[PDB]
Amino acid sequence: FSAPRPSWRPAGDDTPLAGLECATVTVPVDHARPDGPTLEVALARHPARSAGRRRGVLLVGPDDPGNPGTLLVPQLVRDLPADVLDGYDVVGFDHRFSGGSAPLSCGLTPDQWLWIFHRPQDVESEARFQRAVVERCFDAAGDVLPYLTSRDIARDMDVIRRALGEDRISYLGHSYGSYLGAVWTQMFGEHADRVVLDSVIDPSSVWRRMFLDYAVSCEAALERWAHWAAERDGELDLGRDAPTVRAALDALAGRADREPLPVAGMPVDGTMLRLFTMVLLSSDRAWGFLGDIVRAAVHGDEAAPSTLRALGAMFGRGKEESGAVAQLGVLCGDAAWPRDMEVYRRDLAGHGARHPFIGPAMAGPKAGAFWPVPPAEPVTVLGADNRAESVLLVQSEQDMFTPARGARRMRELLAHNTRLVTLAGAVQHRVFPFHGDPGVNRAAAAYLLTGKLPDTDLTLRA
Numbered sequence: 001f002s003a004p005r006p007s008w009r010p011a012g013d014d015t016p017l018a019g020l021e022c023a024t025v026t027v028p029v030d031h032a033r034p035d036g037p038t039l040e041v042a043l044a045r046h047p048a049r050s051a052g053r054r055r056g057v058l059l060v061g062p063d064d065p066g067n068p069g070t071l072l073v074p075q076l077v078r079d080l081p082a083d084v085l086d087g088y089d090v091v092g093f094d095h096r097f098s099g100g101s102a103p104l105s106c107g108l109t110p111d112q113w114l115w116i117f118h119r120p121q122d123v124e125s126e127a128r129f130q131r132a133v134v135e136r137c138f139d140a141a142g143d144v145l146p147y148l149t150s151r152d153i154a155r156d157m158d159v160i161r162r163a164l165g166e167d168r169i170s171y172l173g174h175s176y177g178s179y180l181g182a183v184w185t186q187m188f189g190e191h192a193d194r195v196v197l198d199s200v201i202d203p204s205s206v207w208r209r210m211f212l213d214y215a216v217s218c219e220a221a222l223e224r225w226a227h228w229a230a231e232r233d234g235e236l237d238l239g240r241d242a243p244t245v246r247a248a249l250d251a252l253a254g255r256a257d258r259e260p261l262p263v264a265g266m267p268v269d270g271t272m273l274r275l276f277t278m279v280l281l282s283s284d285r286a287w288g289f290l291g292d293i294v295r296a297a298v299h300g301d302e303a304a305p306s307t308l309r310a311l312g313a314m315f316g317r318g319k320e321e322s323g324a325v326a327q328l329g330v331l332c333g334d335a336a337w338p339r340d341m342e343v344y345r346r347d348l349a350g351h352g353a354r355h356p357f358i359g360p361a362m363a364g365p366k367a368g369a370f371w372p373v374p375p376a377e378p379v380t381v382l383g384a385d386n387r388a389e390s391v392l393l394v395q396s397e398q399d400m401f402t403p404a405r406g407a408r409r410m411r412e413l414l415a416h417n418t419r420l421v422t423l424a425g426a427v428q429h430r431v432f433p434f435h436g437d438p439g440v441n442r443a444a445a446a447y448l449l450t451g452k453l454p455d456t457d458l459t460l461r462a
């Protein structure tokens, strides 16, 4: 496919990309039909600060499906070690049908944007709720949704590499970006220079198995936070023991299921409240925020303005329906979900009830069960034939969203070309470089700049 060189221009100082460059790259909707329709994939670049030390391009993928990867470049400019920013053009992209790359709008209600985490009433009612999301999105975008897959994004990534005029390219990806990098190396690894995958999705869990295991991780994180909160009943007044704290949290969410809780003039229902809980759960540096909002909502008080500025971030003016549709296409389209409602009925009553905070939303009949198109391709198989010269895995020992088991699995599947750096003591998600750990950042920067993996898998302590 014809990949002309991008037309870089300074991003406006009225944008979150101020100080960077912006461009688009043309990709075909159907990579098998390169003369068919196309779309423009948005890019953002921070050029290497030192031409004499320039190694090439560090391509950066989105960290969640639907999350604009261009917005990672300012975060990376802020936190990356200086010699990395000296040596690489940092180039982030918004994956097809998200962000500024032809985002989709299908008329979804705000309640439907949270289809992943939606609390079910029963199998019958949730099957109706989730199928409705599918039929709504296919009514408005059924022409392109079959081309919103992880492998098609990986195809876009190689068009971008060629449009940038690079024979070899480096890659950094977090969470979903770790999977995009893995898939891209399996498909195009002969073009890989240095690769860092951080907070590593288990590539054998695509995707329902990941849903089910997340319910377990969430329970474990809630138990560690309930103990932490219990040790602080003298500030939060939620209980002097974890089960008492959990019971308060549980009842709060139960009321929110009945009646939306007014938070700074916006209704917060049980699904939204549980989502805010889980996001704050994922980093122990955010556990104080969680204590604050639970304390306030329980006692009918107001949360600190700082706490609300995290809530306004995830469900106020920032939020986008385009992200929910992007999640739908990737999560339902990469692999065929079980169609039989018996599977979901049983898993709700067993696994869901055993992991009650988010288990029911994870085990019940999700939109993928009702997908109207067959899978276009198998799930990418990672293995010994991966042609990437080297891949560094970076992983927090305690990560609620992408547990360390996924990184360990990737380390086995790609045993021939990977090394694993684990950060112990970290209750964190997305480590390099945003966590600011000197050990992790030094090791990852040395690899990116020398191309040398650690001699052995490393376990560092924060």
Ligand SMILES: COC1=CC(C)=C2[C@@H](Nc3ccc(O)c4c3C(=O)c3ccccc3C4=O)C#CCCC#C[C@H]1[C@@H]2C=O
Residues within 6 Å of the ligand: 064, 065, 116, 175, 176, 210, 211, 214, 275, 279, 314, 327, 331, 401, 402, 429
């Ligand atoms: C591959 O698809 C996904 C992978 C992972 C790990 C997903 C992960 N959610 C997140 C993982 C890391 C995050 O920082 C976040 C989120 C959010 O949900 C989120 C929602 C609203 C505001 C902020 C966040 C958020 O900050 C969880 C779970 C279960 C099923 C599915 C899928 C999506 C899904 C994120 O996209």
